[PDB]
Design an enzyme around this catalytic site. Sequence first.
Site, PDB file in Angstrom:
ATOM      1  N   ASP A 213      -7.380  61.244 100.355  1.00 48.98           N
ATOM      2  CA  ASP A 213      -6.739  61.437  99.053  1.00 48.98           C
ATOM      3  C   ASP A 213      -5.843  60.236  98.718  1.00 48.98           C
ATOM      4  OD1 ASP A 213      -5.547  62.408  96.754  1.00 48.98           O
ATOM      5  OD2 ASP A 213      -4.321  63.912  97.802  1.00 48.98           O
TER       6      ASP A 213
ATOM      7  N   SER B 294      -6.343  50.407  82.675  1.00 52.96           N
ATOM      8  CA  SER B 294      -7.678  50.135  82.152  1.00 52.96           C
ATOM      9  C   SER B 294      -7.545  49.454  80.799  1.00 52.96           C
ATOM     10  CB  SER B 294      -8.486  51.440  82.034  1.00 52.96           C
ATOM     11  OG  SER B 294      -9.735  51.225  81.409  1.00 52.96           O
TER      12      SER B 294
HETATM   13  C1  LIG Z   1      -0.850  63.240  91.887  1.00 47.02           C
HETATM   14  C2  LIG Z   1      -1.749  64.440  91.687  1.00 47.02           C
HETATM   15  C3  LIG Z   1      -1.823  64.805  90.214  1.00 47.02           C
HETATM   16  C4  LIG Z   1      -3.141  64.176  92.280  1.00 47.02           C
HETATM   17  C5  LIG Z   1      -3.178  63.858  93.783  1.00 47.02           C
HETATM   18  N1  LIG Z   1      -4.547  63.749  94.340  1.00 47.02           N
HETATM   19  C6  LIG Z   1      -2.436  64.909  94.595  1.00 47.02           C
HETATM   20  O1  LIG Z   1      -2.754  66.221  94.122  1.00 47.02           O
END
Ligand SMILES: CC(C)C[C@H](N)CO
EC number: 3.4.23.22
Length: 330
Positions: A35, A199
């Site tokens: 993540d 972007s």
């Molecule tokens: C920062 C968040 C909106 C998204 C990340 N992947 C943790 O949930």
Amino acid sequence: STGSATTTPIDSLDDAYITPVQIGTPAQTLNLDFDTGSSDLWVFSSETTASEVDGQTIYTPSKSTTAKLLSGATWSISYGDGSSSSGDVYTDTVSVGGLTVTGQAVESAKKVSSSFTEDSTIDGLLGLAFSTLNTVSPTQQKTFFDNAKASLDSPVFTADLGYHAPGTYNFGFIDTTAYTGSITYTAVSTKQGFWEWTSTGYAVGSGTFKSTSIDGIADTGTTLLYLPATVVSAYWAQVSGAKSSSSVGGYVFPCSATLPSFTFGVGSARIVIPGDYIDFGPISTGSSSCFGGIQSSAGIGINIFGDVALKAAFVVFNGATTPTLGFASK
Ligand SMILES: CC(C)C[C@H](N)CO
């Protein structure tokens, strides 16, 4: 050093991707969700409330000769989808794709929310955003990438996510066989702890490119592409019968539709997301209403270039002193 690991979609929709990670001695292999939008490495464990474990593989620190309790340390995290987890912390040896870090903080879940329990395919998360977001208290901990960095041949990792197929996370090198053309690099702000970039615009299908700055994060842990309401409305206006449904929670479209592509700018370069990548299938089993893969970021507070966007590219997360992001077509 380098590492290279295959990442595999958890289901037929590419809702998330899991990558095997070796923890402890002898190794305990858990399938983690890498993540780039968070900074905690946490796992289902022998400490997780029993009723909150349903099919996941757990880490058992008492079976690892290299595990050590990080005394006094706790963690607690809430994610963008409303899910959460918390617990205590061990240090142990962690390897990804042949790359080994000793003394990595492995956050052991005592509690996880229902959406984690209900997904048997994800054994925990491996955060790859900046360590300033790590939740361990009272001593904040480093990510796997930050710990590995000094040992790596080059201070980078790359995400090469597949569409309805496996892909690759590499650490420490750029595989020049994995993309076409050239990589276009763009500036990153670390002020919010994310891989945050701007972007240069977008196009819908074969339409003309609209030059406009869109600030957002490169987030492998988010399924969909979340953009400003103006952009998202312009996209779905090209799909007959598409509409935003408050009951469903976003844009839906007739499953009979052929979706247009969506292009986003990276400097003067362009990444094209094929229309099929934007189809997330029936809203419920047997429905002829399908869920869209491009949704509004209004109410999130940030635009998110999630898997729908990233899987269309070879993406370089450059963790040099001044971080940058690179995108290539593939
Ligand atoms: C920062 C968040 C909106 C998204 C990340 N992947 C943790 O949930």
